[PDB]
C-alpha cells in the first residue's frame, strides 16, 4: 500500500446541510387576530396537535415519527 | 445506521475474545476461562494454576 486511486467518481460530496430556509412557522394570519390550521395535525395520540404533516405529492408525512405516519389524502 | 454492527456474532472466533486484552488468537476457554494463551501464562499463578510435574 503506497497510495489511493479513488476510481469512483471524485465524490467528496456531503449531506444536505439541514437545509437552511427562512423563518417558517405560519398557520395563516387574518386581520385582528385569528389563526387557522394549515398543513393539518396528526392522528397520533402521541402527537398532541403540534406537528405539521408535509404534503409532497399525494402524501401526508409526519416528522415527529422517525419513519412513517401515512394518513394519505 | 441499522447496518453498523448488524452482522451476527454468535459462534466462532469473532464472538469470543480475551477478558484481559480482547484478542481472538490463542484463546483458552477450558472451564470458562476465556483468557488468551499469552495472558494466561502471565497470571496462571494468581488464578491458582501452578506447575508441578
Amino acid at each position: 500500500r503506497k497510495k489511493k486511486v479513488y476510481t469512483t467518481p471524485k465524490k467528496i460530496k456531503h449531506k444536505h446541510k439541514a437545509v437552511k430556509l427562512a423563518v417558517l412557522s405560519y398557520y395563516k394570519v387574518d386581520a385582528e387576530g385569528k389563526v387557522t390550521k394549515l398543513r393539518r395535525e396528526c392522528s397520533n395520540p402521541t402527537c398532541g396537535a403540534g406537528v405539521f404533516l408535509a404534503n409532497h405529492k399525494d402524501r401526508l408525512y409526519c416528522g415527529k415519527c422517525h419513519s412513517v405516519y401515512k394518513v394519505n389524502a | 445506521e441499522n447496518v453498523w454492527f448488524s452482522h451476527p456474532r454468535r459462534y466462532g472466533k469473532g464472538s469470543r475474545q480475551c477478558r484481559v486484552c480482547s484478542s481472538h488468537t490463542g484463546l483458552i476457554r477450558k472451564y470458562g476461562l476465556n483468557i488468551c494463551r499469552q495472558c494466561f501464562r502471565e497470571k496462571a499463578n494468581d488464578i491458582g494454576f501452578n506447575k508441578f510435574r
Partner: protein, 112 residues
C-alpha cells in the same frame, strides 16, 4: 450457586487476579503489595496490603468507600455484601512487589 466446583474454583481465581491488577494500577502511589479475599457468608471481605493506609483510607472515609463501590459495581455484588479493609504491610523492607514500586518511582524522579 448452580455452578460446578470446577468452574466455581477457577472463577474465584480469575476474580482474584482481576482485583489484584486493579489495585496495582489504582493504588500504585500508595505502595500496594497484595490482597486476599475471605469468602464468607454474610459479606465476603477483602483486605488491602498497602504501606500508607492513611492515604488509602482517605479523608473521612473517602478513597475506600469509593473503592468499595467500584468493586461491587464491576463484579455485580449486592450492596453491603463486600467490605474493604486496609491493614498495612508486614515488614515492607522484605516485599519484592513493594520494593519494585519503590525502585520504579525512584527512577521517575530522575535518580541515577
Amino acid at each position: 450457586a448452580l455452578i460446578s466446583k470446577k468452574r466455581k474454583l477457577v472463577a474465584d481465581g480469575v476474580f482474584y487476579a482481576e482485583l489484584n491488577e486493579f489495585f496495582t494500577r489504582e493504588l500504585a502511589e500508595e505502595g500496594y503489595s497484595g490482597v486476599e479475599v475471605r469468602v464468607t457468608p454474610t459479606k465476603t471481605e477483602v483486605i488491602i496490603r498497602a504501606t500508607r493506609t492513611q492515604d488509602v483510607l482517605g479523608e473521612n472515609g473517602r478513597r475506600i468507600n469509593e473503592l468499595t463501590l467500584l468493586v461491587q459495581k464491576r463484579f455485580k455484588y449486592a450492596p453491603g455484601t463486600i467490605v474493604l479493609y486496609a491493614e498495612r504491610v508486614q515488614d515492607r523492607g522484605l516485599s519484592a512487589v513493594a520494593q519494585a514500586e519503590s525502585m520504579k518511582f525512584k527512577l521517575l524522579n530522575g535518580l541515577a
